[PDB]
Amino acid sequence: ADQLTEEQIAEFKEAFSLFDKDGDGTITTKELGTVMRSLGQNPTEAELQDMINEVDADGNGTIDFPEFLTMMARKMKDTDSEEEIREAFRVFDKDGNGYISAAELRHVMTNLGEKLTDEEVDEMIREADIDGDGQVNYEEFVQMMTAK
Ligand SMILES: [Ca+2]
Ligand SMILES: [Ca+2]
Ligand SMILES: [Ca+2]
Ligand SMILES: [Ca+2]
Numbered sequence: 001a002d003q004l005t006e007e008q009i010a011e012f013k014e015a016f017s018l019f020d021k022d023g024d025g026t027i028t029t030k031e032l033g034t035v036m037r038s039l040g041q042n043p044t045e046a047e048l049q050d051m052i053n054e055v056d057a058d059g060n061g062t063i064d065f066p067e068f069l070t071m072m073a074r075k076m077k078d079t080d081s082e083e084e085i086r087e088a089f090r091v092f093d094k095d096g097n098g099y100i101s102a103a104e105l106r107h108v109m110t111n112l113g114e115k116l117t118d119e120e121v122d123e124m125i126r127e128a129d130i131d132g133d134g135q136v137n138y139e140e141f142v143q144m145m146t147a148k
Contacts, residue, residue, distance in 0.1 A: 001066065003073040005148055007127045014124060016068050018112050026062035038112060040087030076147040085145050089138055099135040100125075 001009060019027045019035045033048045043051070052063060055070040063071065078084060092100040092108055102121050109116045128136050128144045136144075 001069050003147065004069060008072075008144060009069065011124065011127055011144060012069060012072050013065070014120070015072070016065050018109070018114050019068070021113065026064055027068060028062055032063070035112065038091070040091045041084060073147060076145055081145075085142055088145075089141050092136075092141075093138075099133075099137050100141065101135050105136075 004012070016027070017023070019031055021031050021034070029045075029048050029052050032052065033043065033045070036043055036048070051071060052061075055067045055074065056063060057067055057070075075081065075084070089100070092104055094104045094107060102118075102125060105121050105124060106116055109121075125134065125136055128140050130140050130143065131137070
């Protein structure tokens with residue numbers, strides 16, 4: 001939390017929900033793998049376990065919200081962060097026009113079993129929509145995933 005802006009924190013609150021499949025309040029190594037693979041990533045089992053252990057501050061084997069924020073902050077500094085962020089953007093920009101629309105955001109959420117509401121989709125876009133065109137372009141997506 002001490003490394004992120006209030007907007008990033010807001011976005012990640014929703015992202016935490018995407019990773020928490022069963023919705024038990026914590027993210028497991030398995031859930032992390034499934035969701036990351038769905039978001040254009042391809043981490044090995046050892047890399048997933050390291051990701052968890054590195055920010056699992058209370059050593060309970062799972063990741064809660066505060067620990068998740070730490071994971072996201074560190075992720076933004078990965079040596080291959082640019083590539084990872086590009087691959088994630090690709091997953092959202094289904095029609096490849098360079099913009100993530102509300103329809104495309106709803107599609108990713110629904111594919112991830114995440115129930116949604118228009119108000120929720122509007123807020124997610126609003127938090128990253130710098131030029132205010134109602135969509136999230138690559139530059140805006142990168143900014144949201146940039147450590148400040
Ligand atoms: Ca869970
Ligand atoms: Ca933990
Ligand atoms: Ca698009
Ligand atoms: Ca925009």
